[PDB]
Amino acid sequence: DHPPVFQKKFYIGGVSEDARMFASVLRVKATDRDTGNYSAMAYRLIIPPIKEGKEGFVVETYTGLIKTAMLFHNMRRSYFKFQVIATDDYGKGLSGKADVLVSVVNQLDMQVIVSNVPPTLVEKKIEDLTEILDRYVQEQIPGAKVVVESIGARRHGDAYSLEDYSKCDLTVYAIDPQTNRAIDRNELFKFLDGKLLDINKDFQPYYGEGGRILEIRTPEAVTSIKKRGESLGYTEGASRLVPR
Length: 244
Ligand SMILES: *[C@H]1O[C@H](CO)[C@@H](O)[C@H](O)[C@@H]1O
Prior knowledge:
Largest sheet: 5 strands, antiparallel
Bound molecules: alpha-D-mannopyranose
Organism: Mus musculus
Shape: globular
Protein name: Protocadherin-15
Number of domains: 2
Domain Cadherin: 7-121
Function: Calcium-dependent cell-adhesion protein. Required for inner ear neuroepithelial cell elaboration and cochlear function. Probably involved in the maintenance of normal retinal function.
Subcellular location: Cell membrane
């Protein structure tokens, strides 16, 4: 008689500082090893105490969806290590467990993947596309996890203020469980841009003929942060100050 087994031993996710209350973070799932059943699994989180009556995150008991339960203003680099449990038979059966890491980021952690297909196409296939991106990042940083911040129209024009809904801006970041924070955005750029032709070939079954990533770019918000004189420090190979 065997306990529920989570599909991953370790779920990694992220939230941005501006995430709304009860925003989706990630979904967990456990099944019975012998039958594959999962229709009666009750999911619960085990989170350490948080100040001020905040609860951090909740999980939908019967769907496994983890959602935010507090705001994350100014909390870039905060991290939440907790557990999720699954108990079969609506709580009356055996239990399994997995670890969870959620890291807080902002636009200083992100890169924009620009594609020549509409955002609805990218969104529809996002699970398969994220898994491909994971593979390339994990070759450089084992165990890292790519997270999708947003999928939208391609931004362009002055200050990237115009929207082209026939193309797509896919804003991503990656969380490193060794550091409990995001991978440096310029390292993330190097990982993706350096393999852009290989990633494009892997994306072909999903983007269709003629579809490809056009470029990787840094969010416009990063330029606004430097103009305000924030997060500026030393970086390697340059005398110009770049936001951290
Ligand atoms: C809730 O929705 C987010 C995206 O909005 C997913 O990334 C997550 O896995 C869950 O399905």
